[PDB]
Symmetry: C2
Subunit: 325 residues, 2 copies
């Protein structure tokens, strides 16, 4: 157990230098709890806290025997959520509930934790490993991330108004939602090795979740932002968390694993409420800032002018697919 944990512990320590000299630097003293130096850079700060797991994507990792990217998924889900209040991610703790202390599994998990932490700019400051074979049939990974945002700079969605521009940033793929549906629909029929548009089914299902920290932090530092939505459970329904105004959108072509799922009988109205459908993060900006917002985001990832916020209330119209959510 401790021997398996050594790989995670040593990797976590290597991420401390990501917050060296910055807000959130780990104190690295004492025991039982991690310490983060809040500092005085932020005059009147709010602390932002999120909690997110990977989901049954970890069952795909276990099936194929490739565990070196689920740490990226866990970190991505948490830090991408933190962005949605306008916070800069600082640090993360992991909850790792496992059926056995398999040292090879833990070593691989640590590799992805390090890569995800590097990309998100966060230190992994502690966590808990619970070996519970009676309770866990596999390797469950979740976490809690902490960020910081100035009072007065919190982005809630309250400033969203009709006419605002809606911009989508491409996902890397399926990310970490809808895997239960995808696993049940596709794996018995096709097999994990099935080749679809140049990639095996398991590669489509295990593609690591994209991390949006760098584009979004650059965006909020450069333009006024009215809303930020990480596209997770519920798909486009997450936009309704930001505002009661409506949306009229043109969504990107249905491609990759989403096309295969649709071709296996899942209707589009359901797909847009389950899968990210190619858009992993959506920003809402005053229409005056649309061009500059799209240019900042496009420097990092393929991004899309999706549409507008509408005076019509509550509805999400995906116009090029004839769908209303």
């Amino acid at each position: 157990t401790a021997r398996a944990l050594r790989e995670i512990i040593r990797t976590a320590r290597e991420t401390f230098k990501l917050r060296k000299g910055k807000v959130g630097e780990p104190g690295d003293i004492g025991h039982y709890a991690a310490l983060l130096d809040i500092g005085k850079k932020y005059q009147n700060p709010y602390l932002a806290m999120t909690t997110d797991g990977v989901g049954t994507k970890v069952l795909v990792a276990e099936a194929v025997g490739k565990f070196d990217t689920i740490g990226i998924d866990m970190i991505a889900m948490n830090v991408n959520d933190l962005l949605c209040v306008g916070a800069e991610p600082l640090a993360l703790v992991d909850y790792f509930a496992v059926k056995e202390p398999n040292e090879e599994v833990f070593k691989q998990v640590a590799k992805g934790l390090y890569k995800g932490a590097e990309e998100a700019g966060v230190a992994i400051v502690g966590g808990e490993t619970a070996v519970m074979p009676d309770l866990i049939n596999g390797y469950d990974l979740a976490g809690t991330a902490i960020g910081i945002v100035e009072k007065g700079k919190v982005i809630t969605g309250e400033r969203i108004r009709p006419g605002d521009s809606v911009i989508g940033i491409s996902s890397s793929g399926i990310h970490s939602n809808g895997l239960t549906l995808a696993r049940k629909l596709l794996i018995p029929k096709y097999g994990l090795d099935y080749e679809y548009e140049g990639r095996k089914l398991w590669e489509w299902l295990l593609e690591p979740t994209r991390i949006y920290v760098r584009p979004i932090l650059e965006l909020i530092n450069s333009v006024e932002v009215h809303g930020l939505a990480h596209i997770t459970g519920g798909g486009l329904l997450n936009l309704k968390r930001l505002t009661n105004y409506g949306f009229e959108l043109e969504m990107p072509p249905i491609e990759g694993i989403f096309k295969l799922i649709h071709e296996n009988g899942v209707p589009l109205d359901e797909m847009f409420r389950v899968f990210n459908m190619g858009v992993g993060f959506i920003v809402v900006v005053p229409q005056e800032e649309k061009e500059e917002a799209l240019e900042i985001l496009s420097r990092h990832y393929k991004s899309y002018e999706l549409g507008n916020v509408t005076r019509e209330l509550g509805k999400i119209k995906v116009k090029n697919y004839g769908i209303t959510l």
Copy 2:
């Protein structure tokens, strides 16, 4: 799933008044992340973060169908850990991984979460519920607690010196560690209804973990404290996390569930490395403060003068049981 989650969300919203006006008050704005007001009460603050779970105690809860105390266990484990750096607990998020969105189970879990939050003085500000029947055989409950400690007031263990007094605070019972051993040893032999000293075996195994926030916060604000150890996994071995110095201890009588376990053949040296054996929390203070520390702690719970820190580096001698760990 939304029906079942409503039970916990409603209860968590009711805990917000526990931090109303105090440091750590939650903000009623935003989504995706919880927001905590750090305030001006602290001049140079460290943010303290812990992650801890209930363990397979939740399998006893599921066996008997009584879930309204495992939330106390989860909150207690986290806030008791936070105390060990000298931090005042502020807020908590829960990670709830379940085999199904059972509304009666969630309703019961919420009751214990509320009771634990009230006893610990923390707000429950968010969390994740993950419905994953292929991965979770039961209802797994864990969480992360956040607290605050002034930079100069961190209790590190660095100040522990030979001659320091070692004081134990009684546990409420088995707490949340050693349940795998207790379940495997006792349940098939005796049955959950087996009556021992007036309590059924499941009542012994499910007894909620004690919360030490009140005595420890009073202690640190009154006397010089050199070390604080919540007795969790590893039992007395947790004392070795605080210092390289040794310990000479007299442990309390073996009673209750620990006596039944001992009489079923578990050796005492193993027992002191697995179970809390009646001592849930240990403090280390200068010898001159021993009587004051005992008086403060004894206002709240039965407490023990256990012994002294020794120059015998790295050893824990339990001399009244002839044991060295």
